[PDB]
Design a protein around this nucleic acid. Sequence first.
RNA 1: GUUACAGACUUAAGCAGUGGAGCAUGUUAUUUAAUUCGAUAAUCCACGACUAACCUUACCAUAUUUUGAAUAUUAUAAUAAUUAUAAUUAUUAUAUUACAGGCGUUACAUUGUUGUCUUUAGUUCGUGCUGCAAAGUUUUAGAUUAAGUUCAUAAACGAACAAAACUCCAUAUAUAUAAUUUUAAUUAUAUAUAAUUUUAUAUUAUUUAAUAUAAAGAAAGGAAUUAAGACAAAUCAUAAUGAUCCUUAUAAUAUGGGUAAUAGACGUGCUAUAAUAAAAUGAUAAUAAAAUUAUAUAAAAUAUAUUUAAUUAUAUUUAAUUAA
Lengths: 318, 186, 186, 269, 165, 288, 48
Amino acid sequence: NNMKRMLNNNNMNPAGANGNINNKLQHLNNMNNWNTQIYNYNKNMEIMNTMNDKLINKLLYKMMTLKLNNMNINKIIMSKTINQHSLNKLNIKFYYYNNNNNNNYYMNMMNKLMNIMNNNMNNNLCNILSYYYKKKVTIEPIKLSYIYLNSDIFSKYISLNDMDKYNNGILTNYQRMLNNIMPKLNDHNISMNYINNINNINNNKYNNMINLLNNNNYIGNINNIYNNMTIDNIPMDILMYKYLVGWSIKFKGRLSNNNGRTSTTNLLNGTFNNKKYLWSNINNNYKLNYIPSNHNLYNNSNINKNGKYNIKVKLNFI
Amino acid sequence: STRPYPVNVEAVYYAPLKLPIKYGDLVADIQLRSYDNENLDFYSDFILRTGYYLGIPLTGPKPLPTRRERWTVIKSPFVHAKSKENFERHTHKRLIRAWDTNPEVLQMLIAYITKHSMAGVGMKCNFFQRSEISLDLGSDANGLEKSLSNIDELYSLRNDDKAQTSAVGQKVLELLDSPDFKKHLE
Amino acid sequence: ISFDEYALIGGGTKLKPTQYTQLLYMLNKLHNIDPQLTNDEITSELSQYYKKIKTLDEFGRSIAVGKRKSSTAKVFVVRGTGEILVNGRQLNDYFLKMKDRESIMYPLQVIESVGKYNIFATTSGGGPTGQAESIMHAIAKALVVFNPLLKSRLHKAGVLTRDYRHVERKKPGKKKARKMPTWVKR
Amino acid sequence: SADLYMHPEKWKGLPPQRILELYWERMARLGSEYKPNKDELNALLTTSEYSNVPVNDIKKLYHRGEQGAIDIKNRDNSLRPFMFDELPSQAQELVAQHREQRFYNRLAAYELPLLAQYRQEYKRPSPESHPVTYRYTSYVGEEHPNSRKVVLSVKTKELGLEEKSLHKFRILARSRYDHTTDIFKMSSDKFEHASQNARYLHDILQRLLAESKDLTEDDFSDVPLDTRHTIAKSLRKKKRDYEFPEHWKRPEDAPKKKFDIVDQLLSTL
Amino acid sequence: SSEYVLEEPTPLSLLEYTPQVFPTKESRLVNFTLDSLKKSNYPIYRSPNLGILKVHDFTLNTPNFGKYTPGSSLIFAKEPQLQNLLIEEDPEDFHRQVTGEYQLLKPYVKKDFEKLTKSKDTVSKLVQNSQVVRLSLQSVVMGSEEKKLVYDVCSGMKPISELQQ
Amino acid sequence: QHYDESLLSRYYPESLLKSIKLAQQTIPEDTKFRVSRNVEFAPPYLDDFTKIHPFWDYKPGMPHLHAQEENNNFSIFRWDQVQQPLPGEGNILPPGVSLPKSKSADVAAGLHKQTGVDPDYITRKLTMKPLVMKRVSNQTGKGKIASFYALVVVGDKNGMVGLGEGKSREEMSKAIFKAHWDAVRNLKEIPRYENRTIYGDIDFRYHGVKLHLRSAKPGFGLRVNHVIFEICECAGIKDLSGKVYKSRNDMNIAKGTIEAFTKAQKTLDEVALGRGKKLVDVRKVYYS
Amino acid sequence: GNPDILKFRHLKTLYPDIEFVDLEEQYRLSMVEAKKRRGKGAPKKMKK
RNA sequence: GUUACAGACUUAAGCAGUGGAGCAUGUUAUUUAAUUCGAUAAUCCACGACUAACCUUACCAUAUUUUGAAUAUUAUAAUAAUUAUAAUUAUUAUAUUACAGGCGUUACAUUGUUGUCUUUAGUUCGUGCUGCAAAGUUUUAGAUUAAGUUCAUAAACGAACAAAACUCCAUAUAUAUAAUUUUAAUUAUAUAUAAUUUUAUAUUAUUUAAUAUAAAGAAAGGAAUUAAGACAAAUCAUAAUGAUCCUUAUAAUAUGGGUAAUAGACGUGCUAUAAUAAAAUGAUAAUAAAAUUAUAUAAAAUAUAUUUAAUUAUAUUUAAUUAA
Ligand SMILES: [Mg+2]
Ligand SMILES: [Mg+2]
Ligand SMILES: [Mg+2]
Ligand SMILES: [Mg+2]
Ligand SMILES: [Mg+2]
Ligand SMILES: [Mg+2]
Ligand SMILES: [Mg+2]
Ligand SMILES: [Mg+2]
Ligand SMILES: [Mg+2]
Ligand SMILES: [Mg+2]
Ligand SMILES: [Mg+2]
Ligand SMILES: [Mg+2]
Ligand SMILES: [Mg+2]
Ligand SMILES: [Mg+2]
Ligand SMILES: [Mg+2]
Ligand SMILES: [Mg+2]
Ligand SMILES: [Mg+2]
Ligand SMILES: [Mg+2]
Ligand SMILES: [Mg+2]
Ligand SMILES: [Mg+2]
Ligand SMILES: [Mg+2]
Ligand SMILES: [Mg+2]
Ligand SMILES: [Mg+2]
Ligand SMILES: [Mg+2]
Ligand SMILES: [Mg+2]
């Protein structure tokens, strides 16, 4: 009875079995729903800060496109920035995409731009930002190797770069490429496997606790509780979102040279329901109380010769 | 498995320790506001840990009631005023209270907290100074000199074994040391 | 094992209720074989398909907290001769409506124990009728501790049920909860 | 040293990777104010055996950056199929959170014990000598205009006064003196800085004390204590003054200690 | 995959992060010094200017930075180095912050009012008015000289014309 | 658990030893250590934090929140490659997956899965030809819903031929793909005299279309309706005369003509077997 | 807001090395050029 | 203007209203120098507009601005910061064109968003199969659910978007925390668990499903989410953009006026037409919740209206707190 009581007191684990919690690798922090991660007691000041942040975003967007002697215009796509306002310091951060060992000996335009953000001793952009906020700023770029890992980047890139493929109409090859980005992953199978792995982990911890046990609720040493639990085994299995299960991309507006009317054209793949939440302890949560956590929706509206159009993107991520 | 995990690691893995309160001489209370929980709770836990280790009997995250700033808005850009949408914002509030500490230790704690602060969390501190009734700022120069000596004692490099150093702090110390600074008052 | 549990090893989405019922029938009959005559093989095949008390205080009174609408009623019920004190004053002085008093009495009236138990009620929040109802609710819970055999009877009477009836919020377009503003087909 | 990139003359004897790193640093630090160097070029030529590049080609690249590279030498690979070697946005955010957590755990483990060096036992000022409590407020990251607010607060009986003088002091205080709790407090927000405000409050207190101790042709023996503000405050708040009747208690009806024999057997200490 | 280089925490590293308002006398001096450094435009919250970059040594802290009424655009004035940098460190500011010294204005005496106006009752009224003004102006925050000017104007010792300048 | 200094030094580095000692001094031996259920400070796996991980901790030289470095110093001056690649095994492949004219190859592959047909043959020897390419519509409550209809003869040019039709609401390429798929599913060995023409003069009715297809002397080409010609090219018929009466509905011609080929024809050998007689071809005997 | 905020003009001042492109401005210029071409350019402003 | 079920605030009961009165507000019409512009069947009419004195405003009268709010190009000159009396840069000034600017016109060029059908149960995908085919099957013999949701039967098998569920509020329980003076522990807030409730006896219809009874439970709601398509539904007056038109004027500033005009008409409301209903009074101050207070919330108290005083309204003057 004492042993049972001790177990009950210590019974905690990663959520997702059928005494458990959602770990920081199993769900998003609701702070990562907003883009200006701040609280100030004077709300005027907070408003001023969020205005500043918004203005800096525009500036960053402007910077992102370079030129090379009027030969090549490499348009680096960037995500919407997320500004982390700690008491000590601001930290701006964004995800970005850029399209033999010969380039160890010259600085690329993108590289130069990235260096400008933090490395130029006095001249750097972070230093200049610090005057607007009255605290040390740190811009961290994060490179994405694919166009479709971030939703904003995906939508933005298609808006800016791939004009010719959809201006008159969506070219067949381009559409095919869009369709067959991902390899049609059995999302049901993956979610179920993840759940099984979580169950196994829980059993392992429980087994260890039992082994230790053979009015105070202290078990044995840490090494014996977490016997088989390590950095190599657990973290990557527990990591929640990893697999772009399903995605929808919508082109809309005057994307027809002959026609006067508009054209809604939608590409759909995979699924947008998550089966990890359907049969387990882990529950779905809503970002800004209206977007299922796993979803991420975005649009970007480039102007054409004919007028305005936009490109919705929506990915699922198991 | 012949791998000695020392006590600090164990403490990290378990809940944070709290020192008992000898006397109810509330020295400082620290309120933590944020627009969500997960970061805030973590930060509070971290504050408790630092308070305990080289610490001042901190009580713990007493949740003060959350606010609710509501705002309603017509969904459309034009007319359809029968359809309206709500919006809300919850200011989550937690209280820490330090109970018995010599001011310097409390300052250090607070300074440490603000150094390794988290993203979403704002902070406010109410410090309390139990002073005597009658006071005097007449015997001045000597008191200034004493204060400077105390500062010097506080910020002395004991052993330069690649310790944490600050350029601005060094500059401040140099300014405090200077003859010009001493002259200021008289 | 459950239907869903069986599906994961069995058919999955293609598993039907009738199939599951058949499987259960097959297992149950096998299990029913007199334990002495059973085999090892059978048991191996079947292996797959397996898988606080309330008391009185130091001073002999049962505390209980009841709620209704916005009201909350913490009530100390004790074995002394049946007198009432609502919120630090006489019952007729607090609850002017006789209906509220009758409601309060009802837990003691379903039992033959009005007059047996002294009751010290302490209410907060809501209005008078809701407060009285919360007190009643608390009293029933308090009584339940004195004799657990009457608990079922109290539940049947409808006193042990927490009355959930919660005030509906004003929705945007509507004037009150349900009351919409006038329609006009013209 | 740290300041190494700035001097291209020194680094010829270093390994090739290190030389490359220094070159990259140099390019970074002075971005627009970059100006080529002979020693640096020589180093870069020496490194060339590391990463497969000819001697003329490296020199050409050094002279002309991206244009040179182009001259030395593409298909769009934006929607190339997923090779499963990079986490998505949400995933990456979750990882970052986990990194942060780990960092904080590390801090808790190895820096907070170090912090316990700087540890002092409490040196209490006695309530007899130190009755007044100047509370200061500070908003950390922000610059609130309430940071200037300082609040003095004292129990009036703890002040060194005779009984007549105490009454006079209380009368002078008016709304500031509460009578239920024998406490007099006052806050000042008039001045720019907090210290100023505290000083002003102190000066006021001193003036109040001086007035209390006067007694020359001004006693205030026959002005009763005005307690209207306090009763108004009490009305605004709620009260839970009532208690369980002491004669209603039944210690005899309370649950007696039930005899647990196995527990008794166990307790051999 | 490398060893954690533990840099030891120190009071010196936690200097700057000390609360701007803390009761202690020692802390007050430090806070004042920090404020003076900030006023001087010392590299706090930012990387310093040394003798490495020559052309691009820019700053934004000019006499009227985040302000509209002075007609200009963003002015990129060159920063000094860490050497050749002055610190303002004014006495009045020190008096305000470190000690708790305050001006309180001066109460206008009746004799001064008699100098201008003749009748006694009128003088007394003017004195009363000046007294009323004084306490209000003490309560308000504006500026040492400007506030005094306003007080004088309200009294009638100076005319209305001295404000509009 | 309070360990000795020497033991700690053996397993832990020299920097953290002092911190460990301090922790031991501060925290007593008799300690309870509660389990915080409502918030988790530490990770779900055991880790002595002495070793900084490449992926799971922050990259040292990279700037971020919680940098703990100077504004000048950030050791990260190339942004071409990714900073923190994935740990241990480079991939994050699920269980049972693999890493990676074209349309025709995809069709062939799909056929091989569904019906065990040789993909290489489908890719190379079979050659397709669209016969009809309608846009077609249905009046739904939603509205008029258009649909692209294809009808596509495929055929190895050695008497192996198949017709196929396909349909897609999405653009015609998909419909054509479906038609091609259908055609390869329905491959059919037509009989033909001398590997160039039909045996007899056939006269066949398929629904509306009345077909008439005469045999032809060698060299005399395909002299028939364009649909018939297309089908013959794919099916390896070099020589053919003929004429369509009544309906000339392209689809029904295409369906009717392959039916006529498979059904109306009798090979000489089959006829000989049925009757019990020799059935010589005089020209062949002569040697032209 | 804060009127002294970084603009595209400055992104040339701070970083001359990087040949930046303001996209909206470029678009506007292209539109203006198109207007000039097809006889829909702005009329020349009166001075007097 | 059809067959037969099913549907609900559809109807029927029922309770309170509108419609009559006066006022408020929106609309119309007409007026006006201007009564700015749009919304105008359900799906406009206290709607856009969560406050029209000036402003806001877009309208009108009279005045006066003309590279103007931007970006770039080309020149003269002046001031300030930095360096070791010169120079580099940053700015400002005067001009110089391209232009800037436009609540001007077209949501029948667009974006995004929204209304109605709609929390309605539909909408598709491969693929397979039937029909020469458009198409059909899937998506239904048979029933049922709130339901394309679930049983069965079926040339179908799955699927995606919908439905449901996860979500939020509220509830019950547990744990943690709060030195029970920031206390309301009768609380607040993080983390769990809990139900789309379960079990059994009977009575009708065919192993199940509805009724009833019983015993076990705190166990009973609301919110968000409103698919595809359609209505060339609404918006160029949130904002942006295409085309087009204005460029000493259709752009910009000030002073006043207007948006508040009034024959009839139309919605929404408010106050009424008195005794199952109105008014005075009720200080050991009968009983709430939710939310706001550094572009503030303003307590006590004095004075006048007012011979006592209370009430109510102002003035006098700011105690306390930027807040469990
Ligand atoms: Mg009705
Ligand atoms: Mg009427
Ligand atoms: Mg009426
Ligand atoms: Mg219009
Ligand atoms: Mg109108
Ligand atoms: Mg106009
Ligand atoms: Mg224009
Ligand atoms: Mg506009
Ligand atoms: Mg339209
Ligand atoms: Mg639209
Ligand atoms: Mg067919
Ligand atoms: Mg159907
Ligand atoms: Mg159908
Ligand atoms: Mg739903
Ligand atoms: Mg209490
Ligand atoms: Mg719809
Ligand atoms: Mg229309
Ligand atoms: Mg219209
Ligand atoms: Mg427009
Ligand atoms: Mg005009
Ligand atoms: Mg005007
Ligand atoms: Mg109006
Ligand atoms: Mg209305
Ligand atoms: Mg009446
Ligand atoms: Mg009052």
